[PDB]
Amino acid sequence: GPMELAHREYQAGDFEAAERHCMQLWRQEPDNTGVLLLLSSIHFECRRLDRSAHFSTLAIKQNPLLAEAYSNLGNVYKERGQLQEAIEHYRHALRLKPDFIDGYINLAAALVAAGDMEGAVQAYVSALQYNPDLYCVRSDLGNLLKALGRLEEAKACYLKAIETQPNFAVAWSNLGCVFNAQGEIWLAIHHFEKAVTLDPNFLDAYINLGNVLKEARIFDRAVAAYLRALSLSPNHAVVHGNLACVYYEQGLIDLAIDTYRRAIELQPHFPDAYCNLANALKEKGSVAEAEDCYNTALRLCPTHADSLNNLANIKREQGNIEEAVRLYRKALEVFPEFAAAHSNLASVLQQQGKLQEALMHYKEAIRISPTFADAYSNMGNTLKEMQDVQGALQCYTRAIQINPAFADAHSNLASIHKDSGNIPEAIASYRTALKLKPDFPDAYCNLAHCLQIVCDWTDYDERMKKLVSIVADQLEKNRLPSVHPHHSMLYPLSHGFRKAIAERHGNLCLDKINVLHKPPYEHPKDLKLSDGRLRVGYVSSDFGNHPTSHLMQSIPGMHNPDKFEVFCYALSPDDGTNFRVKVMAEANHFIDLSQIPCNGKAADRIHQDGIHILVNMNGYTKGARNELFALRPAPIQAMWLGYPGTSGALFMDYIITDQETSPAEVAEQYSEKLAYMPHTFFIGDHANMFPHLKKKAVIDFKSNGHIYDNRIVLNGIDLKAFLDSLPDVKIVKMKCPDGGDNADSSNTALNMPVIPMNTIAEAVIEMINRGQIQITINGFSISNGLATTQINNKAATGEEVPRTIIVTTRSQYGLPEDAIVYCNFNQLYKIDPSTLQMWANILKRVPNSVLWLLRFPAVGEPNIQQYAQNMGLPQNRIIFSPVAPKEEHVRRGQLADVCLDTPLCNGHTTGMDVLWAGTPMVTMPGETLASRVAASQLTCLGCLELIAKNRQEYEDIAVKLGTDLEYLKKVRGKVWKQRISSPLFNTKQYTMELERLYLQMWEHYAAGNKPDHMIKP
Amino acid sequence: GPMELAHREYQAGDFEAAERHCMQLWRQEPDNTGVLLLLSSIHFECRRLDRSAHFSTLAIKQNPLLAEAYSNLGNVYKERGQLQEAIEHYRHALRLKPDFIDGYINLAAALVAAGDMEGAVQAYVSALQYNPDLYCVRSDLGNLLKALGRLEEAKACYLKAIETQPNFAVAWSNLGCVFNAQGEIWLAIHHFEKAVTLDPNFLDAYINLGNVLKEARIFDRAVAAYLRALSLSPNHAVVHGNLACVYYEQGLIDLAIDTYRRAIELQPHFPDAYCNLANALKEKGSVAEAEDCYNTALRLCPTHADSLNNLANIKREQGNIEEAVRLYRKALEVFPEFAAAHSNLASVLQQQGKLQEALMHYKEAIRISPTFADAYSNMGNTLKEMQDVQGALQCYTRAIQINPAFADAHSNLASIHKDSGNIPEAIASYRTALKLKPDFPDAYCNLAHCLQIVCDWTDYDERMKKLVSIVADQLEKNRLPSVHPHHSMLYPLSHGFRKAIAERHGNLCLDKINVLHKPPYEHPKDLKLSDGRLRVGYVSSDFGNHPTSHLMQSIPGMHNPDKFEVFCYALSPDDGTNFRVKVMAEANHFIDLSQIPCNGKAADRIHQDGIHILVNMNGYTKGARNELFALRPAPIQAMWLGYPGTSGALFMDYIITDQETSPAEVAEQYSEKLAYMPHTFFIGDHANMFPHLKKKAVIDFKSNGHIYDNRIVLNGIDLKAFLDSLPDVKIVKMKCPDGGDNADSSNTALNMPVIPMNTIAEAVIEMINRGQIQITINGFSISNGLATTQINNKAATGEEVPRTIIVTTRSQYGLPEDAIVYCNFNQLYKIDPSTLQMWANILKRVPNSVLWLLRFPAVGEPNIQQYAQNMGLPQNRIIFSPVAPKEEHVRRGQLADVCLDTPLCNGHTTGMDVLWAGTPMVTMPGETLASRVAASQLTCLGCLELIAKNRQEYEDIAVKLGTDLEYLKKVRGKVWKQRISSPLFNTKQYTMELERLYLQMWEHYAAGNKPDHMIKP
């Protein structure tokens, strides 16, 4: 009867005896249908919930005042859906029994199943308010509040639970999840380790420990945590992805490959492993599978951004630009924050040329991710390409400030330094990069050139041999050489190599021009409508104040308009030089192009101009645009008066030279043809701008009786107008080797004016000795060369003729008055150790000898000083002046005795300067056109003995001259005597022969014949 | 006057205005000398503590009631030493001013400077009791209590401090130290990271974080923590050691080398880095520096144990045993817990031979460190050497249970399995090791032999070729071959290889014997005092129940005592065999040696015995001690009646053979000489132990008229005594090829007794058919061969002659009555695929043919079954019986038709069995002595046609016999006819010729001549 062994069968889990005995109870004592609801609890477990409703109906019918029937009613109703009604009678419950426990619990279970979190929380908190011991209900507020987001209020529920039942191993792992959210890992992995020590058959702790151990980049322990995690469940398919990532990061690639296969096997629909597997393959070589795998990944989802980026990159290694373009577009528009896509897109845009939008991509990429040095470097490349921002230099610097492990970035900023004039910084940076990058050739090449600028010849021949190997090797790799085409003529290389580099750069230029597919010009054969007058075109980024201009400036002045019409084309923007003033002054057609960035319309403009002959000044130099010639608009395009070494363009037509400078033997290394001058291709210009030095004057020396022209002299546009003012001075007929013929002229320029001790002359001597600015006697402003720029800079800038009378002194530069002056003025870098041995020998073999140099740049003086005594010379036998502007630059040479040449590559213009000054010059031909230049001027002067054939000959000639002072005197003589009679200055004749040669060229072309070596005009 | 801007100058830190103004105060208001004690505070900072005492004297004199004077007095006194007096007036202080603060603090400073911790603690706690705000005093109780050791009471002082002033960055790092002590690292590295985030110019936190990060075996983060630690202090010399250890553990050896150099540079006296640097070098090759560095280390301290161990190891690679011995002794006695030294010492003891003490070293090494698998493996080697503990097998198992990555350990336990009879386990283990160790040759060799036991011929020729390569390669490495000398004659190898392996093992044996330096014996030339009688010695670990004994047992029975005296030497302990009973029964001198483990006294005993001729039975087999012969005590030592293949000992003297088995052609591969028998060297023994089978009897077959001897037969010691009891049975003269001569004898053994249907004979037939135990008629116990062991095991063990009458039936083993029976009984492993093809061919070419085998072992039946039908045979054409003891083993052969030989290596004894049984035998000579054996018996029988010369001949002979049933009948005839007349059994004659040959040998030796091939005796 009344007995709970039926409830004990419930304790066992059966009903048979319980149900029969409770059936007996109903048939004897129908008051406990609640036991039938316990039977209904069996029914909940055994789905006989219909009979649960039956028993509940009985209970409520007999006993309408027991909540528990409604409780079971709610359970079955939640199974059957009416959850709001379940709440209806649950809240109808808990009224008659306010202290009922399980009602609150499963009520909250109901509401949370309905989405009404807030009510559920109050339900639990009420339950706790009644009972503080439910050590497994607290953890459920944990699971709830932490889901709501009120983290810091959660972490106070777990902790009560833990301290209540300290073996509880589910209130440690959850608490681990909270600390993992707030960001403090070093506690999160602690709490997890406690919660597997307490219960080593628990799976969630093992995973979560794996995850937070592969964020903190511990790896070995992460592997162990996973391995146990799956030996509790061996087919998890999500462990199998992470485990691969860890294997891939340790460096054990093959295990990653295998495990990824296992993961995709276990679960097929899985884009991430596809993408990541693709990366795993791509780094192992089998790229074909990589592309296919990326295809599969975006098949399962066309929006998975990572695959888009990576596949686009893969295509971009095959130049398939637009595919990658649109794909990067897609990824960026899906994910508007993905910095890597920004970088990749911008770089391919750099390939596209358009860059300002690429610039803003670089900007925004940094904006989202402020720690991406690579983008800084690349955007610096962009800026340097589009302008010359030194803030871009700062951008490089920022990259180093983020990571100083970039050899390439250092190389960049060093390039800016070299361009600017910051030589030491560039040196330091290149050494930095090389010490970080042993293998980098380009840094080696630029560093080599910089060292050659600074005369530091440590390991000299070693450097040349290594870099010769590098250029040969690089050229075989079918890439553009590191060595700049201009820099070549410093290093000793084969003719084949120098040519090959020239064509490398030339074909590079035509490679840019080709892709534009601009229509060809049908220009040629226009000599009839031309009405017998030809058209000549010159281009120059150096119309203005530049040595090239200083050399060709007067050529348009006497061009024949009858059969020729001249067209000027200034590439550079104007700078208001008097040079340029003259340029458009006598120009038949002056045309500016600084307003024309378009290669097209410029070339087209040439096409309408229909210029028969087109001539270049620039070639490969700083600041030129040769592609304008690469399109070959005009029928004939030629090199002239530029750096030697043919471009190898194959569309250039005619070099300019003479019979001897470029003989036919070396015609194998010049891509294009030859044109021969009667005397030389290098035309003088000084007499036009400085005819004032046509006559001179010299003061008396400290000693008398002997002649000393080259210590202190007098010059001035009105020096002759000053001679008559002199009361009585000596005028000796200075003689070259004469013998008595042709010296019996008026000899105004052939008689040296030697002023002996004269009262006015002596006086002005003392007022000049003290460094006084200038004095004026007899209406003539008496001046020194040193302060002519202060008197009027324009007089010395060459553009303006000087007016005053000029005096110069050896000791004005501290020069002793009785030392044999050997000198030169070429830029410093064109000197090597070997030639330095040559000056060493000659200077040693003369006691009262001095070598004159320039500190241009000044940073090389210590280094040359070192080797000066290393081969045993004092630090007083060599004297080096500072840089002086053009007029006094050429004037101060007149004080010197004998200049000497640099055999590595001659001074193109400077040798002309000293020759015009009347000082002698001596050289030995090399083997390159540049090297061969120097003898050309002498041959035009017809002084063959001043040319050597071997290095020993050079030394012997220098010794023979330096010893033979008398012959030196008459050498300065005959140089002076020829310079007035030389054909080097008949610019009338030069233009004459030049135009005549053009007409011969054009008449040969009128036959349509191929260009050929037009020897013997 | 009264003004504290003097105290403000103190705030600045100067005294000038303060001291002058307070001097003015004293001269106007002499009441504040305490300001002069503030001046004295400057004095403490500026060592003017004498004037501090002066000012204190003034203050106490005027004001004897201010503690502060005593406070300054205590400070200076602590400087001056009287610290107990400092406490004296400090405790004298704090009386008038009980609430003074700084007194408590510096009081505790005083006491802790005196070693009285306890009082100091109360001092601080009192201070706190007054003021709860001293956020920088709590941390000092921390520093104190944690030093006392009351950790868990410390951690409650820090925590109050931290929450008081949460920026305090010295109460985080210390608290980190506490958690590091209690053992919970994952909190320790947390608290440190908080305490560098709060203060990044703090050094102790950076080190301590480094240390606890290289215990938890994080490495990269440890490197970073150190690198910053020294960029705050760049010459620390203790960081520089740990940093090396971390570099060495990452695998970046060279950085470790460099940093160790840097550490020893910074600080010279530093043994640990020396020792550790030595390890760093030793693993890089430069061992010479390693020894020197260890020398330096123990120079700075002769007690540094680690260096002792490592240096001793280094020496032990140079065999310098005693040096390492004493050194390990030193290290162990310094450090009585160092398990590694225990292991090393024990292993070198294993080299020393003495092992029981090495055993206890292994025990104690495990005892201290219960997780050292290596020692388990080694001690297992020891135990297996000294006894055969299978608990040692368990020791191996324990090693795997610690780490199953030991291929070598698996190989060991597999060796035990193979020795025991646990073949499958050995197979599994060897495969396990090989799959873990691709490179291991020895496992390959043993695994190969095991496979050959189990007939699994997968990849057969591939295995032989690979292992042939391995043995050649191993032999060139000047090491003992993996292949056991006995196992060789299974694999096909060159004569050179087999010889070479024999000498490898032989020289190995003499290598053990050599080191003992036992004095040589002056035995030889003793034939005069011998009085004309020679002495012969036999050794055998197989006197007893063993085939060798079963073969030579009766030889001592007829040895001539006149000129020879025999000496027996049983190596093995007695087992009470009737064999052994006979052995000492007719022995001239039976000598036991199981009581003699000493090689010495045994060899000496032989020396006093002065035995002229010494003969071996064992050779390289299981259970032998050949070194006893390696010492060559007796003048002459010979191989005889053992496994073929000369030992290559070079101290063996004479093999035994005949003219034909071992012709002179192959004498190149036998180290020692030859001795020729008139007929053969292999002597029969059966007639002595089984003369009962001299006569037989056969029952009638199912069919009549034709003769069928080989289906059901009768035997028994009294079968002839039973023949007369028969009323009337047929006695047909069974004929070999006779022709009518010599067959006209009494023919008792030449007439086959064929019992036709006879009432008593038929009756006993039925009472045997049902498997009845046995029946008895006419006083004769009628028995079947199958139950003879149950009747009396002794009768079948060979030792005892059977008594009853024996019957046997073909179907008694299920054999069909009319199938051609081809058979053999050799051990299973002496079969290959190729010969199996041979039986395949012959068995195919006869319809009613059956092949009889044995399942010995039974594990090979499935594998042979596979290949049986693989070459296409049914599973009923081959029948295999179980193992049967000796008597019925040889008896059941009589039912068979024709036995067949295994050409790989013949059955030494079994062929003799079947020959004695009268069944025919056929073979083809191989090329090794073992192979050549089989034809020897036939040649002694003079039946040459039963010998083949090629494999095809073998098949053709088998076909010709199997087809020719009549000739088969007369073949069984002539085998039976010869076996009674054969010289194979005249043991009288065998001993005769044997002794005569000894005497010839000894008479040749009496001349002192070198041993030579004594052909033609």
Author numbering:
A (entry chain A), B (entry chain B): 23 to 1039
Give the article text.
A single pair of enzymes, the O-GlcNAc transferase (OGT) and O-GlcNAcase (OGA), catalyzes the addition and removal of O-GlcNAc on over 3,000 proteins in the human proteome. OGT contains an N-terminal tetratricopeptide repeat (TPR) domain required for substrate recognition and a C-terminal glycosyltransferase family B domain (GTD) that catalyzes the modification of protein substrates with uridine diphosphate GlcNAc (UDP-GlcNAc) as the sugar donor. Here, we present the cryo-electron microscopy (cryo-EM) structures of human OGT and the OGT-OGA complex. Conversely, OGT disrupts the functional dimerization of OGA and occludes its active site, resulting in the blocking of access by other substrates. This mutual inhibition between OGT and OGA may limit the futile O-GlcNAcylation cycles and help to maintain O-GlcNAc homeostasis.
We next determined the structure of OGT at an overall resolution of 3.69 Å using single-particle cryo-EM. As previously reported, OGT formed a scissor-shaped dimer. The TPR domain of each monomer consists of 27 antiparallel α-helices, which stack together in a right-handed superhelical conformation with a lumen of 22 Å in diameter. The conserved asparagine residues line along the lumen and align in a ladder-like configuration to engage substrates. Structural comparison with previously solved OGT structures reveals that the catalytic domain (GTD477–1046) in all structures adopts an almost identical conformation. Consistent with earlier studies, TPR6 and TPR7 of OGT mediate its dimerization. Mutations of four conserved residues at the dimer interface to alanine (OGT 4A, W208A/L209A/I211A/H212A) disrupted OGT dimerization, based on size exclusion chromatography and cryo-EM analysis. Similar to the previous reports that showed the dimerization-defective OGT exhibited lower O-GlcNAc transferase activity towards substrates, here OGT 4A mutant was less active in catalyzing O-GlcNAcylation of both TAB1 and YTHDF1 here in vitro, indicating that OGT dimerization promotes optimal modification of certain substrates. We hypothesize that the dimerization of OGT stabilizes the mid-sections of the two α-solenoids in the dimer, allowing each solenoid to transiently reach its more straightened conformation for substrate recruitment and release.
